PDB file of C-alpha atoms and ligand atoms in Angstrom:
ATOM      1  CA  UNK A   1       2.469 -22.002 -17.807  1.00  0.00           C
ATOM      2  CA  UNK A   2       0.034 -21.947 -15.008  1.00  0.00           C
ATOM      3  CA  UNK A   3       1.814 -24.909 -12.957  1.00  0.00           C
ATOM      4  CA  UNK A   4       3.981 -23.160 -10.426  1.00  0.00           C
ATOM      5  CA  UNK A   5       4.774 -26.109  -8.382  1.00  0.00           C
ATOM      6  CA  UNK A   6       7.812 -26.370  -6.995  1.00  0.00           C
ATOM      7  CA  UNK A   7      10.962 -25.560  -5.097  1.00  0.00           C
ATOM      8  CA  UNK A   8      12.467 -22.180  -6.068  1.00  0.00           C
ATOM      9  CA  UNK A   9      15.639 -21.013  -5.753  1.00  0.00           C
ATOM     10  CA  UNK A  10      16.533 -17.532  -6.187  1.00  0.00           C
ATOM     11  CA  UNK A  11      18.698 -16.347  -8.944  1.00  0.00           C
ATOM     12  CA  UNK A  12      17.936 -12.721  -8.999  1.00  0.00           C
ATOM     13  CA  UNK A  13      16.755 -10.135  -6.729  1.00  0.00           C
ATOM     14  CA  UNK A  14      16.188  -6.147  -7.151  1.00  0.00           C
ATOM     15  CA  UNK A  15      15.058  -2.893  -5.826  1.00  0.00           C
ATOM     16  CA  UNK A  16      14.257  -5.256  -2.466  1.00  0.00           C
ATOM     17  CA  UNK A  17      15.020  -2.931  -0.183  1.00  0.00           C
ATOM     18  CA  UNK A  18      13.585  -0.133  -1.518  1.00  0.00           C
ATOM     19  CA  UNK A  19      10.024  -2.600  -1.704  1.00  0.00           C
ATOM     20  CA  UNK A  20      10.763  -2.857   1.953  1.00  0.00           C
ATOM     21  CA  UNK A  21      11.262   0.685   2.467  1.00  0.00           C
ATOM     22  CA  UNK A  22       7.756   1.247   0.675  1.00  0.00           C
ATOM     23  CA  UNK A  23       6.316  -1.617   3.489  1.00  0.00           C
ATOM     24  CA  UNK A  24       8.000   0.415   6.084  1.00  0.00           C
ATOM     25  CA  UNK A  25      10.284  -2.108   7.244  1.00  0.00           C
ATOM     26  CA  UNK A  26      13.100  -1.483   9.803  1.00  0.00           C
ATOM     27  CA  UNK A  27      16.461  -0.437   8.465  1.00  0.00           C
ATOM     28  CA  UNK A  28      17.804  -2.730  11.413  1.00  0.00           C
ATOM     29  CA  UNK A  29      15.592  -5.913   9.447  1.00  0.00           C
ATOM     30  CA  UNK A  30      16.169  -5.043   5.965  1.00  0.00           C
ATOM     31  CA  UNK A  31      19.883  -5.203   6.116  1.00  0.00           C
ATOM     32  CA  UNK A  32      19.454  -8.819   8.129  1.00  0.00           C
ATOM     33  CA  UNK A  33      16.599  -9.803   5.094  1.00  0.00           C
ATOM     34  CA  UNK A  34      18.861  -8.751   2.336  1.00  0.00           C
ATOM     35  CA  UNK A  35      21.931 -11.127   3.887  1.00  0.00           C
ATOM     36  CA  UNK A  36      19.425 -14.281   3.990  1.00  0.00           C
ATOM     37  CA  UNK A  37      19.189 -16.651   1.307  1.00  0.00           C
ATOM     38  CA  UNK A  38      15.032 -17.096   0.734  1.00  0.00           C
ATOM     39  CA  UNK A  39      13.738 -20.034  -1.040  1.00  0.00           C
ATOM     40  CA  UNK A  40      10.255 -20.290  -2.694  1.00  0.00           C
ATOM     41  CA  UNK A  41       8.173 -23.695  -2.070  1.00  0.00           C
ATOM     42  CA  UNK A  42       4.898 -23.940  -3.872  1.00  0.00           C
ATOM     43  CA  UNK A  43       2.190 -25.900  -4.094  1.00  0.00           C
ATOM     44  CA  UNK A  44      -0.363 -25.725  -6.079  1.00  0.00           C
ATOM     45  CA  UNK A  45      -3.743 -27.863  -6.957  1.00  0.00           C
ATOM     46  CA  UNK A  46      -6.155 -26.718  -9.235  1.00  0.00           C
ATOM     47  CA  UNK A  47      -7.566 -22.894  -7.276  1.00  0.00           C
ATOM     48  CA  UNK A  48      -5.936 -24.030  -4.492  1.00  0.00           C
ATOM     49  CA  UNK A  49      -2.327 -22.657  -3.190  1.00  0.00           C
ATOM     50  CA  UNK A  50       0.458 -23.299  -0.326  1.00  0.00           C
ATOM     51  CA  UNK A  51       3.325 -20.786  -0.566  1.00  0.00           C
ATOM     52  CA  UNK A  52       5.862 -21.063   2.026  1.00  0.00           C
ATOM     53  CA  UNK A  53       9.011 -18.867   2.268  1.00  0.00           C
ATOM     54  CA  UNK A  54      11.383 -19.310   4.243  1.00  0.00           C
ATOM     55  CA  UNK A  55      15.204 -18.051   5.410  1.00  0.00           C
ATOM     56  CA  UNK A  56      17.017 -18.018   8.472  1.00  0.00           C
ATOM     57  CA  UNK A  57      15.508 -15.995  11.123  1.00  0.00           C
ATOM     58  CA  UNK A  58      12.192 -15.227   8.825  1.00  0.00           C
ATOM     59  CA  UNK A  59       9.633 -17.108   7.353  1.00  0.00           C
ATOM     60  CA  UNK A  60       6.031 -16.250   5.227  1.00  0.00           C
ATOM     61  CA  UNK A  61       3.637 -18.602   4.653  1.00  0.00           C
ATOM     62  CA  UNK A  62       0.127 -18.271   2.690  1.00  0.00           C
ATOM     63  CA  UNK A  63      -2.693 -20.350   1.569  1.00  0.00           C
ATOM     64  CA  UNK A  64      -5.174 -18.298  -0.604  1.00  0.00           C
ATOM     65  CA  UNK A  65      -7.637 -20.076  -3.415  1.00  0.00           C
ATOM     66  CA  UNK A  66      -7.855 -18.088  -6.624  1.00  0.00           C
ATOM     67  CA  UNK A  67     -10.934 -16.164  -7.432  1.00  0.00           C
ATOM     68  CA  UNK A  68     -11.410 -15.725  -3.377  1.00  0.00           C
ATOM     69  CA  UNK A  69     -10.756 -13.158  -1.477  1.00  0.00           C
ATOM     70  CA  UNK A  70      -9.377 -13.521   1.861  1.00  0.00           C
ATOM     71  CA  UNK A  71      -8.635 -11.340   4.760  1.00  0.00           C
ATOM     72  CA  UNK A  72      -4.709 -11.495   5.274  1.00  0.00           C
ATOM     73  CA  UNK A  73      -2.480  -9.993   8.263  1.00  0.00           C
ATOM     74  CA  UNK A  74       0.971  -9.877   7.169  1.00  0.00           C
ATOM     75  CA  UNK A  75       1.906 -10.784  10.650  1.00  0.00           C
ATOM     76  CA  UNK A  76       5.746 -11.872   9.792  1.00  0.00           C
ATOM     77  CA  UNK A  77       6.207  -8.740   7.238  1.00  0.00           C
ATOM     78  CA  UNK A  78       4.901  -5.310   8.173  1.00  0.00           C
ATOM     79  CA  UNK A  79       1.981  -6.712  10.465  1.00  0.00           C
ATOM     80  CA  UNK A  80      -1.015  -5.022   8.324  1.00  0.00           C
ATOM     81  CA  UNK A  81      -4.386  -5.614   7.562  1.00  0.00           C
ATOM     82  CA  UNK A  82      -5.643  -6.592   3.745  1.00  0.00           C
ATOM     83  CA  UNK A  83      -8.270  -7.562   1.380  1.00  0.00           C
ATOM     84  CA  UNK A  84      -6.164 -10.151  -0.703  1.00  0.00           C
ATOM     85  CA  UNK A  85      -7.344 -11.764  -4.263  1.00  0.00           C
ATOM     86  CA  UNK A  86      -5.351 -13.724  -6.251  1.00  0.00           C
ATOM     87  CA  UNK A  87      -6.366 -14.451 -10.142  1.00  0.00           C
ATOM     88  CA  UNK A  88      -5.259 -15.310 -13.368  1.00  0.00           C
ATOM     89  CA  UNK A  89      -5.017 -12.850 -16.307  1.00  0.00           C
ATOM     90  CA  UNK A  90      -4.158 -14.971 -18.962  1.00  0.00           C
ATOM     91  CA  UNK A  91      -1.290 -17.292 -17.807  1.00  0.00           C
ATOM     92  CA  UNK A  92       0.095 -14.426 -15.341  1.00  0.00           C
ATOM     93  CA  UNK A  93      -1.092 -15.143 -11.556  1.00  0.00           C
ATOM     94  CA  UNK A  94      -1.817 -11.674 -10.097  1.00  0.00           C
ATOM     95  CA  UNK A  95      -2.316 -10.709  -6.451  1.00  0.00           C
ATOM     96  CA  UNK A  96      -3.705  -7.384  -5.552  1.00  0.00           C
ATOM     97  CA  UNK A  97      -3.621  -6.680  -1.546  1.00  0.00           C
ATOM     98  CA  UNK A  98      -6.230  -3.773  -0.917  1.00  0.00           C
ATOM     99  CA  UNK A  99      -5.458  -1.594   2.199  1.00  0.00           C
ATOM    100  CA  UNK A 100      -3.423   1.294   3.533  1.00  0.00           C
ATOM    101  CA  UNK A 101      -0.627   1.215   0.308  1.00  0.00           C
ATOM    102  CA  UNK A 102      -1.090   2.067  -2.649  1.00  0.00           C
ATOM    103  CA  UNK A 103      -0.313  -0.853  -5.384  1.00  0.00           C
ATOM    104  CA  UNK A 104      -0.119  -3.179  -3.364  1.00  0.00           C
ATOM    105  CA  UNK A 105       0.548  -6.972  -4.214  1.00  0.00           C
ATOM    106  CA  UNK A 106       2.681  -9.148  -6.915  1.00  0.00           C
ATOM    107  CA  UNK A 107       2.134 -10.676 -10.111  1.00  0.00           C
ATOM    108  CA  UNK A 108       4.520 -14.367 -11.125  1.00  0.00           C
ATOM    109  CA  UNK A 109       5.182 -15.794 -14.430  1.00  0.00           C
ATOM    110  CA  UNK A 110       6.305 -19.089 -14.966  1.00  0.00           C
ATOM    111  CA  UNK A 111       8.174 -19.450 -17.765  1.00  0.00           C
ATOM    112  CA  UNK A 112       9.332 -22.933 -18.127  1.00  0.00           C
ATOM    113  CA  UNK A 113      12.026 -24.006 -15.319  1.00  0.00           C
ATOM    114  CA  UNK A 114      12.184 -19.822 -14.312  1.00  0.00           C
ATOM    115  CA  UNK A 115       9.997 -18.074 -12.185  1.00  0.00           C
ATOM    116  CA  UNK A 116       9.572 -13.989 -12.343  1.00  0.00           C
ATOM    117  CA  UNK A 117       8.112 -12.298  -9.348  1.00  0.00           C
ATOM    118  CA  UNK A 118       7.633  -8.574  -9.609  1.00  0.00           C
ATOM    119  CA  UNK A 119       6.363  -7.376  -6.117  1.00  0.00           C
ATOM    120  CA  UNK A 120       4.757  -3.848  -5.752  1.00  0.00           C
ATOM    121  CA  UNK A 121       4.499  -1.294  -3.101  1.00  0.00           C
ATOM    122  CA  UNK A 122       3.909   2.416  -3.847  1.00  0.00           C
ATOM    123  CA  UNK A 123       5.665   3.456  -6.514  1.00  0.00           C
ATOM    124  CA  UNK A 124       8.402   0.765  -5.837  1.00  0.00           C
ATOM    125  CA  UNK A 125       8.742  -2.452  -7.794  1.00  0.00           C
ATOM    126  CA  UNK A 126      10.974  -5.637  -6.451  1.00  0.00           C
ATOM    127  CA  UNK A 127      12.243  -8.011  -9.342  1.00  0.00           C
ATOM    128  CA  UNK A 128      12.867 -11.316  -8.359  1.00  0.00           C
ATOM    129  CA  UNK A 129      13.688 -14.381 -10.761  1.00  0.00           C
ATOM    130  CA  UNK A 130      13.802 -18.183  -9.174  1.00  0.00           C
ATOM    131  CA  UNK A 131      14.944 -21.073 -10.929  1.00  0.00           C
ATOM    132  CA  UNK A 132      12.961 -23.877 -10.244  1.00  0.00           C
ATOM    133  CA  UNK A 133      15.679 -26.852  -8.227  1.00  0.00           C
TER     134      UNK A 133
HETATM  135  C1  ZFJ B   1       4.171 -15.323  -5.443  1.00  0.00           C
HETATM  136  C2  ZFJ B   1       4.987 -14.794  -4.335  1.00  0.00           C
HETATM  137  C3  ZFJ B   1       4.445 -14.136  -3.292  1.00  0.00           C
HETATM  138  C4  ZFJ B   1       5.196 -13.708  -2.074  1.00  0.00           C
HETATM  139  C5  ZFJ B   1       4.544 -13.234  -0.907  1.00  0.00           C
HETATM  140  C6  ZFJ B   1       5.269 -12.838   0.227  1.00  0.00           C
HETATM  141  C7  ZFJ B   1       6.656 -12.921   0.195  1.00  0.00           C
HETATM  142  C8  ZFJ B   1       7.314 -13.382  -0.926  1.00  0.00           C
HETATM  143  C9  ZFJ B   1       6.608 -13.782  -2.068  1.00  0.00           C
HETATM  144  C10 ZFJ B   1       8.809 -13.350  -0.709  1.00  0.00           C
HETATM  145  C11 ZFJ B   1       9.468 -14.723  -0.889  1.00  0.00           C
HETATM  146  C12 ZFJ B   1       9.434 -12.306  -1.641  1.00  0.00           C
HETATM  147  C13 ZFJ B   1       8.890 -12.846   0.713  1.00  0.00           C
HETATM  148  C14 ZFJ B   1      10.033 -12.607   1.482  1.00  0.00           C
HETATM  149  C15 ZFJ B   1       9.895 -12.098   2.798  1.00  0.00           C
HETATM  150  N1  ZFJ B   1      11.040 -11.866   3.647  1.00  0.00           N
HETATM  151  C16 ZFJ B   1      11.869 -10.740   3.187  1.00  0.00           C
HETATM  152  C17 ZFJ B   1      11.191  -9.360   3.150  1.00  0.00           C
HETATM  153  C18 ZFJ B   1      11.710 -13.132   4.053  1.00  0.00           C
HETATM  154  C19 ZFJ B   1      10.830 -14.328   4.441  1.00  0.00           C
HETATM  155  C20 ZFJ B   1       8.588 -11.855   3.293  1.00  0.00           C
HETATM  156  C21 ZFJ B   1       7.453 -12.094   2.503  1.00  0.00           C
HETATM  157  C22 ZFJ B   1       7.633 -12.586   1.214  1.00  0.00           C
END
């Protein structure tokens, strides 16, 4: 579906610290980021999207409108510069992050009461999977 409303809770999570590894992330931060429970909360309305994720001692928030591209410092992450767009191919929402790395970005599908979020960095790939609570 294209409704990914919600508060998601993670069931699943892999290759995530080699996708930080690829964002150049501190050793010292992955090993606290891989330790921290992360939940998902989205809202969506029509174009128009909150995502919020949050943990412990980190937290990522974003607001983007499909079909617009925005300019986007990953301030909380690894504090770089992008062009962001989010869109929909078919009922798959796709972000692509144009900058410095290579493949940058993440695609979701929502498939019923599960969420799948594959984000990319170089040649790394995360795999996450939320179930929606
Ligand atoms: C559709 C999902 C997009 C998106 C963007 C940014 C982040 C995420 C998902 C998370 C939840 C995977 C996430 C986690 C983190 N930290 C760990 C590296 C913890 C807050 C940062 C950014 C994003």
């Amino acid at each position: 579906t294209r409704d990914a409303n919600g508060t998601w809770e993670m069931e699943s999570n892999e290759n995530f610290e080699g996708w930080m590894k690829a964002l150049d992330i501190d050793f010292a931060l992955r090993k606290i980021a891989v330790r921290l429970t992360l939940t998902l909360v989205i809202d969506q309305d029509g174009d128009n999207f909150k995502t919020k994720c949050t943990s412990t001692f980190y937290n990522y928030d974003v607001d983007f409108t499909v079909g617009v591209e925005f300019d986007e410092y990953t301030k909380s992450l690894d504090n770089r510069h992008v062009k962001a767009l989010v869109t929909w191919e078919g009922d798959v929402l796709v972000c692509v992050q144009k900058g410095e790395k290579e493949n940058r970005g993440w695609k979701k599908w929502i498939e019923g009461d599960k969420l799948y979020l594959e984000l990319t960095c170089g040649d790394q790939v995360c795999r996450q999977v939320f179930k929606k609570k």
